[PDB]
Subunit: 125 residues, 2 copies
């Protein structure tokens, strides 16, 4: 149904890497070529998974599994849980950085109009 | 004094972009290629990036701190800004996490099936 300049209606710029990577299907040759609906859907799915924090690699694996299995709902459920747990790990890492920044900033004296900043000194060593 | 890929003892591969972008200094010797206060500054830049400052942020920051009398005050302020930036990111991540929790709540008790409500929801 669509031509790829169209179908970039999924909010993706004209993307050969996706089918180059097997994620997206190959288009079919119409009046010669060249057109891509279930691909529209697969591309929505992929775009949103990426907005949900799945890497392209993860999406590659996931799609292989769901495509080849009988219980697709179960697969997808499982991967979504693994994703929740991944996001939680990222969150914790950011919290660890926040805490570091906090300790750094708490190093500063009452009078901060000085050349010597314990933050800079600390990060310099 | 130090040299070259020895300055890559800061854990950064040989980096022209920094000096091109004016972040780092650089000298002529016998004719090295020398570069010590640069060692400190490059440590500083590296660790700021490990703490979530972007290159652009570091660019600005270094401009301000290099030109000001109260450097500590500046660095303190910028650090507060960074903490708050990190906090926004954390909250964005919590929104995504909850989105995923809701998605997974859509799936039926018996999941051995072709139809997945998660996939269907993300498709529309
Ligand atoms: Hg499901
Ligand atoms: Hg300070």
């Amino acid at each position: 149904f669509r031509i790829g300049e169209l179908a970039d209606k999924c909010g993706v710029n004209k993307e050969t890497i996706r089918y180059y990577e097997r994620l997206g299907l190959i288009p079919e040759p119409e009046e010669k070529g060249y057109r891509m609906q279930q691909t529209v859907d697969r591309l929505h799915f992929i775009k949103r998974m990426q907005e949900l924090g799945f890497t392209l690699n993860e999406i590659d694996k996931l799609l292989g599994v769901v495509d080849r299995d009988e219980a697709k709902c179960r697969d997808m459920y499982d991967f979504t849980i693994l994703k929740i747990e991944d996001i939680q790990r990222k969150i914790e890492d950011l919290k660890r950085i926040e805490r570091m920044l906090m300790d750094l900033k708490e190093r500063c004296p009452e009078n901060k109009d000085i050349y010597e900043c314990p933050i800079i000194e600390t990060l310099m060593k």
